[PDB]
Ligand binder design. Structure first.
Ligand SMILES: CCCCCCCCCCCCCCCCCC(=O)OC[C@H](COP(=O)(O)O)OC(=O)CCCCCCCCCCCCCCCCC
Ligand SMILES: CCCCCCCC(=O)OC[C@H](COP(=O)(O)O[C@@H]1[C@H](O)[C@H](O)[C@@H](OP(=O)(O)O)[C@H](OP(=O)(O)O)[C@H]1O)OC(=O)CCCCCCC
Ligand SMILES: COCC(CCO[C@H]1CC[C@@]2(C)C(=CC[C@H]3[C@@H]4C[C@@H]5O[C@]6(CC[C@@H](C)CO6)[C@@H](C)[C@@H]5[C@@]4(C)CC[C@@H]32)C1)COC
Ligand SMILES: COCC(CCO[C@H]1CC[C@@]2(C)C(=CC[C@H]3[C@@H]4C[C@@H]5O[C@]6(CC[C@@H](C)CO6)[C@@H](C)[C@@H]5[C@@]4(C)CC[C@@H]32)C1)COC
Lengths: 550, 211
């Protein structure tokens, strides 16, 4: 039980380590689900045929497949970390892939048979598997091909829409409800309290946060564009309050993380790059504000830090855009193409420096050592490949001052430099982007459809008020400090549980039967069976012909 | 597709423009020209109007603004993102989604040829500048399709057309059945079944002997 809790994750709790089983085992019965135990035994002992045999017998087949995939992945990682023979790691990874494919195929069959029962199969609480739905197990196993399935996407859409029924033209109606409160009681709701049901939907929280962020960006632009006085104005105080409350919210999110150790929670929070960049930006804004409330030079330095910091908050609109179906994969494709582009940037930088050093050395042979020498190399050779290729700034005409010795090579060097930079490297980069686009596009689609779950969960967990006035919700949590019906799970009775179990057994039997029928009717199997039967028939007929009494 | 990419381009452009205008001009009263300097020159810069000393001005010499060296450093990154990354990704997007768009456009144009022909069959004979004469003619005919849509035929021609259609549909079904029967999959399936039955029969014959 301890090793299963170690392999699965932080929150998992096996049945062996429960107090009831510990008390039963201290003074030493049977198991209600024997194949649940035997499947885990066969998985932990690295017996794939036995595990595949035990998987198809019993209830909760999809949960067993997902748990087996996670266990095999964890065992492979542990074996690789302990410098094994490296064949054990490959075998365990193949076992994990096989179990993942089994889970995906079972989900496909279940969704193809019935839709509502399939969506009920992915959300009911699993008593025997540490109270975690199939979605949580599939996410913990990083199974991208499971969350990207159509049924999982429909389930995520239903969880995202909250308790509202509108599906044709949404978004605008949510904005109308947020901006005009006397329009909430005009929408259809799934089966006084209507306001609470409206404002707790993830989509309404998302649009509230979006509008607050747009207003904050507007105020930031206003305070940086116009002249700043000795003390902050009202808009500047609103911007400062937004930054401060966002920092408080980040601290609260860190404090309420999954692990139990303070330093362990920080490490798991500093995994997404957005969190690290947000921390850096908030710290830089605090430094700029500290410098801003001082005399004139420090005030100018703080204003310049504001002007630098506005760029990051403008860039962070792509995180808001990532909710859109078409603007998410494009942003991720951009992220991958930057890594593809860095190398050609390096090569072009080499060529640019090569031209610039020679031009500056030839045209200016009487220069004392000053740091402007390091600026003339990069400045104009970089600007000239973007449409500033002006002559007489390069290649000066030299009534006229005397021409420098050898100052005719410069037009010849900037005839090869432009040809290399604008005809060769950029066209090769275009070809590289062109021939590596299909794989990047497919990967981006899969990863975005996977991360939809994290988006929906983090907007289900978040408070209802946007960051500029979220301080009220934090004070409410203080009062509740001294004091999931849906969105994660879906609790059902025993009759519904039995119906779900029967549906799953029917689906898995149909899946195996259809797979066997497909295998038996393939051309290769028909050819093989026909060849064997023809060989046996030829032997028998030769025996008959040899055995004659006349 | 281009309008989907223009939003990201506009985000980058606005970030650079706001940063530059805020760095260079810190003593500006609130006027609507502040909302114009953000879009104007950052937009013209990516179409070949990169003009140093109009951006990054040299500063007998007026004093340099605090942090004015940041502006060309932001310009380098802005130009690299706008003119090397997003435009090349847009080229790749246009390149990899061209075959389907081309085929769909061909089919849709060949479909809409019918609507073009019908709307020019229905229209009056005079062009719009002097179409008022034809409208006045319709007024006189208000108080008063041999071809182009249909083609009326007699009973013998109708029977001939019916017989031709019956012959065509019979030939279509016969050809489809002949194609199906001679496929490799059907031949393999029939051969396997006949081999199985023949093996059963020969085993029965061998098991049934009298000498
Ligand atoms: C380090 C930030 C400091 C902020 C304070 C100073 C800001 C001044 C410079 C602005 C730099 C901001 C860029 C940060 C964006 C990176 C975000 C990230 O890592 O998410 C990863 C994110 C995913 O990581 P995940 O959490 O594992 O999923 O990948 C993305 O989707 C990012 C794709 C868009 C990034 C390309 C756009 C950058 C253009 C900036 C060029 C400068 C324009 C100047 C005009
Ligand atoms: C400044 C905005 C910054 C945030 C960025 C904008 C935030 C954002 O991008 O949200 C996405 C959402 C768009 O989707 P939206 O809810 O309107 O509706 C989708 C749309 O009808 C598609 O045509 C549907 O099929 P497909 O997709 O063609 O296959 C899709 O069905 P499904 O397949 O999903 O079931 C529908 O979901 O909202 C808007 O952008 C409408 C603008 C309304 C407000 C306009 C004013 C902002
Ligand atoms: C010439 O004389 C003008 C004068 C009127 C002066 O009133 C000023 C009031 C603030 C206002 C409306 C003005 C100029 C900058 C304007 C900013 C530009 C910003 O752009 C936007 C740009 C795009 C947004 C994404 C970001 O912000 C605004 C938040 C911002 C914005 C529209 C806030 C509004 C500002 C005019 C005449 O009347 C007596
Ligand atoms: C304005 O007054 C300046 C003065 C300080 C003068 O000291 C000089 C000492 C040499 C030094 C540091 C200076 C200018 C050119 C500098 C070169 C630029 C080159 O670039 C690099 C560019 C990139 C590299 C790949 C190639 O070399 C350097 C080898 C090179 C480099 C950094 C060597 C260092 C040079 C400044 C003030 O102090 C009293």
């Amino acid at each position: 039980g301890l090793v299963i809790e170690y392999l699965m994750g932080g929150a998992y709790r096996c049945n062996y380590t429960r107090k009831r089983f510990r008390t039963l085992y201290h003074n030493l019965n049977h198991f209600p689900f024997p194949f649940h135990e035997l499947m885990v035994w066969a998985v932990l002992m690295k017996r794939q045929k036995m595990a595949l045999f035990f998987w198809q017998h019993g209830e909760e087949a999809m949960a067993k497949a997902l748990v087996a995939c996670k266990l095999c992945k964890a065992m492979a990682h542990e074996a690789s970390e302990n410098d094994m023979v490296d064949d054990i790691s490959q075998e365990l990874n193949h076992n994990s892939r096989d179990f993942g494919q089994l889970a995906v195929e079972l989900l496909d069959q279940s969704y193809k048979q019935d839709e509502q029962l399939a969506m009920k199969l992915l959300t009911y609480e699993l008593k025997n598997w540490s109270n975690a739905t199939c979605l949580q197990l599939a996410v913990a196993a990083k199974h991208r091909d499971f969350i990207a399935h159509t049924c999982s996407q429909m389930l995520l859409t239903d969880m995202w829409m909250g308790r509202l029924r509108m599906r044709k033209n949404s978004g605008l109606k949510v904005i109308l409800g947020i901006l005009l409160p006397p329009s909430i009681l005009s929408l259809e709701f799934k089966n006084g309290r209507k306001i609470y049901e409206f404002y707790n939907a993830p989509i309404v929280k998302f649009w509230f946060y979006t509008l607050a962020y747009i207003g904050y960006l507007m105020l930031f632009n206003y305070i940086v564009l116009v002249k700043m006085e000795r003390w902050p104005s009202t808009q500047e105080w609103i911007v400062i309050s937004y930054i401060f409350t966002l920092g408080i919210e980040k601290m609260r999110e860190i404090l309420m993380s999954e692990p139990g150790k303070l330093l362990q929670k920080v490490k798991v929070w500093l995994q997404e790059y957005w969190n690290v960049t947000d921390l850096i930006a908030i710290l830089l804004f605090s430094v700029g504000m500290i410098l801003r409330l001082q005399d004139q030079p420090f005030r100018s330095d703080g204003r310049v830090i504001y002007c630098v910091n506005i760029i990051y908050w403008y860039i962070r609109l792509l995180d808001i855009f990532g909710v859109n179906k078409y603007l998410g994969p494009y942003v991720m494709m951009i992220g991958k193409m930057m890594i593809d582009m860095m190398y050609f940037v390096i090569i072009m930088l080499v060529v640019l420096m090569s031209f610039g050093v020679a031009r500056q050395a030839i045209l200016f042979p009487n220069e004392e050592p000053s740091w402007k020498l390091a600026k003339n190399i990069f400045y104009m050779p970089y600007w000239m490949i973007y449409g500033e290729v002006f002559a007489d700034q390069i290649d000066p005409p030299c009534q006229l001052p005397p021409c420098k010795t050898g100052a005719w090579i410069v037009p010849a060097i900037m005839a090869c430099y432009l040809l290399v930079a604008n005809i060769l490297l950029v066209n090769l980069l275009i070809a590289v982007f062109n021939n590596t686009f299909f794989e990047v596009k497919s990967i981006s689609n899969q990863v975005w459809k996977f991360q939809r779950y994290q988006l929906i969960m983090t907007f289900h967990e978040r408070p209802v008020l946007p960051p500029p006035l979220i301080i009220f919700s934090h004070m409410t949590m203080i009062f509740q400090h001294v004091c999931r019906d849906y969105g994660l799970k879906l609790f059902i009775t025993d009759d519904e549980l039995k119906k779900v179990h029967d549906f799953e057994e029917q689906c898995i039997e149909e899946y195996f039967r259809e797979k066997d029928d497909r295998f038996n009717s393939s051309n290769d199997e028909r050819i093989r069976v026909t060849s064997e039967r023809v060989e046996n028939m030829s032997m028998r007929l030769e025996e008959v012909n040899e055995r004659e009494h006349s």
